[PDB]
Design a protein around this nucleic acid. Structure first.
Lengths: 145, 101, 117, 138, 56, 109
RNA sequence: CAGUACCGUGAGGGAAAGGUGAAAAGAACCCCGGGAGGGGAGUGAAAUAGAGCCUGAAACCGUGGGCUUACAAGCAGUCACGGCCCCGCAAGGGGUUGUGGCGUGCCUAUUGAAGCAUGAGCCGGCGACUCACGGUCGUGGGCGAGCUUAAGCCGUUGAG
RNA sequence: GAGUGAGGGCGCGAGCGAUAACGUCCGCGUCCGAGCGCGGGAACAACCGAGACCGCCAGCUAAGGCCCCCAAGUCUGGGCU
RNA sequence: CAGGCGGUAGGGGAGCGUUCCCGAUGCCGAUGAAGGCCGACCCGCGAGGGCGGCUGGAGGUAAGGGAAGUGCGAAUGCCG
C-alpha cells in the first residue's frame, strides 16, 4: 500500500540511524508472512479410505455395532416415528451411533440427530464414530463391493 | 552427659532425647530400633576414658522416627549471559530421636 | 493465526520481583536490575553457601590453640600426638568442648603427646 | 549447631612494659591478645578485650639497628610536602606516641580495631590514672 | 554542562528538611478577643489606640 | 468523623508538602491560626478546606470546636495539561502542568 | 465526525481518540460556598457504579505504619553469627540490618575486558527466518515390480 | 549438518628487528581464548600447583604456607648475614 | 557396580509455558471463570505447575492430540 516515501536523514537524523517508512514499528506495518492465502492443501486416495473404516468398525464389532442394511422405520419423515424404532430396536443414550441411508425420505426425516449422524450420499464421518460406536449401512454395494 | 558419632562426614553430640537433621539412611519409619559405632563418649560428671577407640564390642544407641522432608536449594551462576538458572536440590532430612550407649 | 505476547513477560519477570524485592531500591524496582542482582545474590548467595564452610573451619581451629595455650601447649603439635597413636578425629569443631567444661579435653591433650616416651 | 558463642564475654585487665622491652617486636603480641583471643568463648564478631596498660613507655629496649636507620613514613603531603622524623628524635619526643608508632604501623582495621585499641595507656610512670586491675605479665 | 543520569529522592528531601514550615507569629489584644499578628488591623478586639475598625 | 479533602487544582504537592508536616500535631485552632497568615499561595486554599470538614463533621458526625485535634494529613500528585513555549533555533521547549490531590483529617479528642 | 486536527508553497504530507448500567432511572434538599470543587442524604444489587463513569496494573506520589542512620571507603547484593517489633503453645517462621569475613555489574565486541571504547531516560505494551511452489537427505508409514493421477463432470449445508 | 583463515601469550628453537618491544612472520608444545568460575601471586586469562552438579559448624594432601592486619612451631640444631 | 560431569559458536534429547482447532446439541462457574494483590504449603531439577484467602464481575475450556504472526531487557528502535 505505497508508503509515504521515506523520511529524515541518517548520519544525524532525530537520533536513530534509520529512515524508511517501511514502518518496522507501527502496530500495522512491515512485519512477517506467517499466514498467506494458501493454507497448504494436501490429500490422498481410496488406498486408505477403505482399510481405515475396516479395522475400526471391525473392532467396533468386537464391541457390537449392528448393520440392518435396508428397512422400514415408519413414516420415513417424523422424528418420534423413528423413535418407535429406537426403543423397539434397542439403542439408547450413551454409546453414540452412526448410519447411512441414501433415500431423501430419511433425509427430511432425521433432521436434527441428537446422539447420532444421519447421512445421505458417500462421505466418511468415522470422526464422531471414533468417540462413539453403533452403526448401519446401505447395502454391501454402497460400502463399495 | 553427651556422646558423638559420624553419619558420613557429619559429627554430632546429643543429650538424652534430641534430633533434627542428619540427611538420612534407609530402614522403615518410626518404630524400628538401630545403632552403629561410637568415638569415645561424652562429657560432664565423670567421663574421660577414650584411648585407642573402643568402637568394638560396644556401640551407641538410638531410636527411629521418619518424617522425610524435601529441602529446597536455589542454584545459579552468571558470567557472559551464561546464568544457568532453574535448579533446586531437594535432598533428605530426618526427625528421629536418640538414647544411650 | 494471531499470536502476540500479552502477559507471559510478567510471569518470567515477576519471580524476579519477589525473589529479590528486599535489596537496595533500584536493584529491587527494575525487572532488569533485579534480574542482574539476582545474578549477584546468585553468584554471591552461592558464593556464601560456598563461603560458610571455608569460614567456620578456621574459627574453630585457632580456638583449639586457645584450649592448649592455657592448658600447656599448642595446635599442630598436639595433633600428630594423637593421630599416630590411636583414634583420630575430635573434629576441629566438636572440640567445642572448649566452652562446655574444660578439664575434659585436658586429659586427652596429654594423651596426644603420650606417644613420645 | 554447636553455637559455641561466648554470650556476654566481659573484658579483663592487665599491665606490661619495662625500660627493656623490645618495641614493635612485641606489639604484634598485644593485639592478638587484646581482641580477647585467649578467651575460649569466642566469635570474631563479639568485640571483647583485655584493658591494657603500658608503663615505662620510653627508652624501652631500642631494638637492634634502628638508631639513625629507621624512618617514619606517614602524613601525606597536601601540596608536595609531608612529614618524617626518625629514631633519635621522635623516640625521645612525645614518648607515649613514640612506641605507639611501631604499633600504629600495622594494626587491624574497622570499628572493631578501634573499640579494642582504646584500652592502651602509655608513658613511663608506672602508675595508671584510673586504677582498675593491673595483673602484669612479661 | 549536560550530565548523564537519573535522580535519587534521597538528597531531594535531605536538602529541604531545611525548607520546613516556619510559622508567622501571633500577638496579644484584650477587649473582645484578638490575637492578631505583628501590628495588624482587624475587627477581632480591634485595638484601643487608633481609628480603623469597630469597637462595640 | 471529621473528613476534609483537597482536589482538582493545577499546581504541585511540593508547594503544600510544607503545608502538611507543620499542621499535623497541633489542634484545629493552632493550625487554622498559623496557616491563615502564612501566605505564599497554599494558605488561601487549605482554608476553605478546614471549613468543609468543619460544616459536616459537626452536621452529620457530631463533634465540637476545641475537641477536634489535627490528626494528620496526606499529600500526593494528580492530572496535568498540555502547553508549549517559543525558544532557540525554531526549537520546541515543551511541557505540561502538575496539579494537586491531597487529604486532611481531624478527630474526636 | 479523519482522509477531519495539524503541517505544506505546492505537490502533498498525514492524527490520537471504542466501552456507565440490566434501566440515567443522571444527585432533590439542607450545611462549605467564587461558578469550581465538597459532605450528609437520596435513585441505586454495587457511586472503590457518577459523568478523563467497566475491570484497572507499570514508570511515578506521598499521609500515615513498622526495621533503620551522623566515624566515616561504598556494582552494593551476599552469607556468618547476633540483636531489636510481627504469626506459630512449641520446635522456631518473618522483616530488617549491627560488626564482620564476600563483593569488577551487564547487553554488544573480541589475541584481549569489570570497564570514561557502543547502546540502555525509565516502566507497559508492539518487535524480526514463516510460506508459496520447487528441489534435496531423514523420519511413522501403506502398497510394493510396481507405485501415483493434473485441471474438470456429477455429487458437497456440510462430505465425496 | 555446523564453526572456523584478526588469534596471541609463554617456552625452547629460529629467520627478522640494534639477544631493542605486553612486536613481527613461523615449526612446534601448552595455557587461555572457550577454564575473568579456584588457589598462589598483595591486588591482576594466558607463570607453577588444580579441572568444576548436592548437602557439609567433614578428614588427607599437591602449589603454596607457620609474628601482625588472618590461619598452622617467632621448632630444632649448625654455621654464614 | 564401575563410568562420565566448565564447557561461546555449533550440532543432538527431551520436555515447559502461551493464542486459535475438534472432543463442545461434553464438562467447572455468581456456594466466581477471565484479570489481579498475597504465600514463607504440595510437584516439578528447571521450563513452569498447583492449591487456598482476598479484591475482581461474564465467560471459559479435559485427557487428548491438531494447528503455531508467541516465547522478547535493549537495536541513540516505535508509542503512550
Amino acid at each position: 500500500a505505497y508508503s509515504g516515501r521515506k523520511i529524515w536523514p541518517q548520519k544525524h537524523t532525530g537520533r536513530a540511524r534509520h529512515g524508511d517508512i517501511g514502518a518496522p514499528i507501527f502496530v500495522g506495518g512491515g512485519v512477517v508472512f506467517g499466514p498467506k492465502p494458501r493454507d497448504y492443501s494436501y490429500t490422498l486416495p481410496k488406498k486408505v479410505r477403505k482399510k481405515g473404516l475396516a479395522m475400526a468398525v471391525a473392532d467396533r464389532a468386537r464391541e457390537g455395532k449392528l448393520l440392518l442394511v435396508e428397512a422400514f422405520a415408519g413414516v420415513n419423515g417424523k422424528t418420534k416415528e423413528f423413535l418407535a424404532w429406537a426403543k423397539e430396536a434397542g439403542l439408547d443414550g450413551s454409546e453414540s451411533v452412526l448410519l447411512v441411508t441414501g433415500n431423501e425420505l430419511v433425509r427430511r426425516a432425521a433432521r436434527n440427530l441428537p446422539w447420532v449422524v444421519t447421512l445421505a450420499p458417500e462421505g466418511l464421518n468415522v470422526y464422531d464414530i471414533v468417540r462413539t460406536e453403533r452403526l448401519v449401512m446401505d447395502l454391501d454395494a454402497w460400502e463399495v463391493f | 552427659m553427651f556422646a558423638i558419632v559420624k553419619t558420613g562426614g557429619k559429627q554430632y553430640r546429643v543429650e538424652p532425647g534430641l534430633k533434627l537433621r542428619v540427611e538420612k539412611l534407609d530402614a522403615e519409619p518410626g518404630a524400628t530400633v538401630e545403632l552403629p559405632v561410637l568415638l569415645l563418649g561424652g562429657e560432664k560428671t565423670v567421663v574421660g576414658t577414650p584411648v585407642v577407640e573402643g568402637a568394638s564390642v560396644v556401640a551407641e544407641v538410638l531410636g527411629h522416627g521418619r518424617g522425610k522432608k524435601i529441602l529446597v536449594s536455589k542454584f545459579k551462576a552468571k558470567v557472559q549471559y551464561r546464568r544457568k538458572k532453574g535448579h533446586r536440590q531437594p535432598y533428605t532430612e530426618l526427625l528421629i530421636k536418640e538414647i544411650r550407649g | 493465526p494471531r499470536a502476540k505476547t500479552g502477559v507471559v513477560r510478567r510471569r518470567k519477570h515477576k519471580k524476579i520481583l519477589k525473589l529479590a524485592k528486599g535489596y537496595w531500591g533500584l536493584r529491587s524496582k527494575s525487572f532488569r536490575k533485579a534480574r542482574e542482582t539476582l545474578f549477584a545474590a546468585g553468584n554471591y548467595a552461592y558464593a556464601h553457601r560456598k563461603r560458610r564452610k571455608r569460614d567456620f573451619r578456621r574459627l574453630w581451629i585457632v580456638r583449639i590453640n586457645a584450649a592448649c595455650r592455657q592448658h600447656g601447649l599448642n595446635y599442630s603439635t598436639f595433633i600428630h600426638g594423637l593421630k599416630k597413636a590411636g583414634i583420630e578425629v575430635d573434629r576441629k569443631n566438636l572440640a567445642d568442648l572448649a566452652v562446655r567444661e574444660p578439664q575434659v579435653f585436658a586429659e586427652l591433650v596429654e594423651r596426644a603427646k603420650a606417644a613420645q616416651g | 549447631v554447636k553455637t559455641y558463642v561466648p554470650k556476654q564475654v566481659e573484658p579483663r585487665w592487665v599491665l606490661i612494659d619495662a625500660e627493656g622491652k623490645t618495641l614493635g617486636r612485641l606489639a604484634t603480641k598485644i593485639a592478638t591478645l587484646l581482641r580477647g583471643k585467649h578467651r575460649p568463648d569466642w566469635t570474631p564478631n563479639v568485640a571483647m578485650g583485655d584493658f591494657v596498660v603500658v608503663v615505662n613507655a620510653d627508652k624501652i629496649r631500642v631494638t637492634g639497628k634502628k638508631l639513625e636507620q629507621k624512618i617514619y613514613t606517614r602524613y601525606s603531603g597536601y601540596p608536595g610536602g609531608l612529614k618524617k622524623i626518625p629514631l633519635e628524635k621522635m623516640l625521645a619526643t612525645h614518648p607515649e606516641r613514640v612506641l605507639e608508632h611501631a604499633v600504629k604501623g600495622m594494626l587491624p582495621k574497622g570499628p572493631l580495631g578501634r573499640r579494642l585499641f582504646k584500652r592502651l595507656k602509655v608513658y613511663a610512670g608506672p602508675d595508671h590514672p584510673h586504677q582498675a586491675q593491673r595483673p602484669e605479665k612479661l | 554542562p549536560v550530565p548523564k543520569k537519573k535522580t535519587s529522592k534521597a538528597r531531594r528531601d535531605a536538602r529541604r528538611s531545611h525548607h520546613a514550615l516556619t510559622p508567622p507569629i501571633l500577638v496579644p489584644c484584650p477587649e473582645c478577643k484578638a490575637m492578631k499578628p505583628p501590628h495588624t488591623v482587624c475587627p477581632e478586639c480591634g485595638y484601643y489606640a487608633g481609628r480603623k475598625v469597630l469597637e462595640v | 468523623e471529621a473528613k476534609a479533602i483537597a482536589r482538582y487544582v493545577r499546581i504541585s504537592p511540593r508547594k503544600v508538602r510544607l503545608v502538611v508536616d507543620l499542621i499535623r500535631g497541633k489542634s484545629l485552632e493552632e493550625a487554622r491560626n498559623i496557616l491563615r497568615y502564612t501566605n505564599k499561595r497554599g494558605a488561601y486554599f487549605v482554608a476553605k478546606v478546614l471549613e468543609s470538614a468543619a460544616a459536616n463533621a459537626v452536621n452529620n458526625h457530631d463533634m465540637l470546636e476545641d475537641r477536634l485535634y489535627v490528626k494528620a494529613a496526606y499529600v500526593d500528585e494528580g492530572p496535568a495539561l498540555k502547553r508549549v513555549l517559543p525558544r532557540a533555533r525554531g526549537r520546541a521547549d515543551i511541557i505540561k502542568k502538575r496539579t494537586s490531590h491531597i487529604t486532611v483529617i481531624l478527630g474526636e479528642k
